[PDB]
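Supplementary Note 2. Why include the ligand at all?

Several targets in our set were suspected to adopt different conformations when bound, so apo predictions alone were not considered sufficient. For every target with a known small-molecule partner we therefore ran a joint prediction. The input for zinc ion is given below.
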Amino acid sequence: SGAIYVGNYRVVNRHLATHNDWANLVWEDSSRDLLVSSTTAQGCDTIARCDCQTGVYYCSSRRKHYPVSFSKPSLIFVEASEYYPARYQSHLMLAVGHSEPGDCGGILRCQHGVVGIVSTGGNGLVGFADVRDLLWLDE
Ligand SMILES: COc1ccc2c(n1)[C@@H](C(=O)N1CCC[C@H](C(N)=O)C1)CC2
Ligand SMILES: [Zn+2]
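The joint prediction is reproduced in token form.
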């Protein structure tokens, strides 16, 4: 579990979104596993605007932060789940690191701020849904 709070927005994994997220829906993309809902309170999260390939992510299954090298956002095939059929997930970045179901929502950060959130994983690989291109989060 986990979300990004920037300005009047809440950024969560689409497959973990609540009824309130859908009642106050701003944008969603099933192909990215992203959903953005509106909030009343202000958000204090700086979103990175960069091409960084190194960062730090929070892994709640270990209650630890791990430094990682990660790939550029791309189309990667993701196996079937109770939320999605077998499809290519866009804007996804992989890293070598620990992840298990329950880690989705862990923020990935670089020196510039929030890069993305855990979305996939398995076999020593962790996948992150990129958010740096959503310039409308900051404006
Ligand atoms: C987060 O780490 C892991 C590790 C192992 C495993 C997972 N997640 C789970 C996972 O990746 N997905 C299920 C929920 C939706 C996901 C998506 N973005 O399409 C895919 C399946 C096993
Ligand atoms: Zn950055």
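The chain has two domains: 3-44, 45-139. DSSP finds one helix and eleven strands in the chain. Comparable summaries for the other entries are listed in the accompanying table.
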